[PDB]
Amino acid sequence: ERYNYSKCTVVVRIMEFTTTLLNTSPEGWKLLKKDLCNTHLMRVLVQTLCEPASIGFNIGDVQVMAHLPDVCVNLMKALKMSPYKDILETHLREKITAQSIEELCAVNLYGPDAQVDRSRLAAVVSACKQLHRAGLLHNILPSQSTDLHHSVGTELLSLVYKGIAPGDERQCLPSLDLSCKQLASGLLELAFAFGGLCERLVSLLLNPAVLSTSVIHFSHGEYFYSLFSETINTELLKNLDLAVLELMQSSVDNTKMVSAVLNGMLDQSFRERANQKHQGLKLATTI
Secondary structure, eight states, X not given: OHHHHHHHHHXXXXXXXXXXXXXXXXXXXXXXXTTTTOSHHHHHHHHHHHOGGGTTGGGOOHXXXXXXXXXXXXHHHHHHTSTTTHHHHTTTTTTTTOSTHHHHGGGOSSOSOTTTSSHHHHHHHHHHHHHHHHTTHHHHSOOOSSSXXXXXXXXXXXXXXXXXXXXXTOSOOOOOOHHHHHHHHHHHHHHTTSSSOHHHHHXXXXXXXXXXXXXXXXXXXXHHHHHSHXXXXXXXXXXXXXXXXXXXXXXXXXXXXXXXXXXXXXXXXXXXXXXXXXXXXXXXXXO
């Protein structure tokens, strides 16, 4: 309690200066020479980011331990355009967030082994979403064979669209704990932090495949839509022209699906219209 709370405030206060007094200057390398010894901030920073319970967030206390990320975020944005950039990139992308391990994290979701099962990717997504706040994410993942980041296009299908519904084995399909609902929704949310995903997403919304079950059948593409509705709708509502184009010209046998998402789009825009003064009139014009 005493030593942990005292060190919690100190390590956060060192991290704070490296942004707030230091890097927001016409030059700082007359100091970044003198501390070229520094892996020690960078390992503490990355462990703070990806497993905060390793230092200070062990205390579980919501006001302090939910603000701690914003220090890490703005320090990454400060070093994004420091000439020091490479030395964070030789840690983050190398240790806490290697490429293929995110596909290996698909082997156990919502399992019996609840003490240890799957918190390891909850760590990963909390870190890499905070890296999107900082903008480093598009380099902390390397680019792949097509305009969509293949690791993102593939986690969409492999960590959730395959894993959500046991239609291959037909052992009964699960009603979802808010834990696996919200977690899947966060993996989806992360996927739409990236570019190029729109033209694939339609084929998973308008999927003609029907689930089999207590014995009755219903659409897999519509099930995914009607379950994950919010995380889909905003990511059709940010990008109205090309989204409505695929929803009206590319859509086929569409009635049992386009009906739902065209209503959904209007409902969720109307829900946000309190801030979104413009976006409903854009949507209306485009349909």
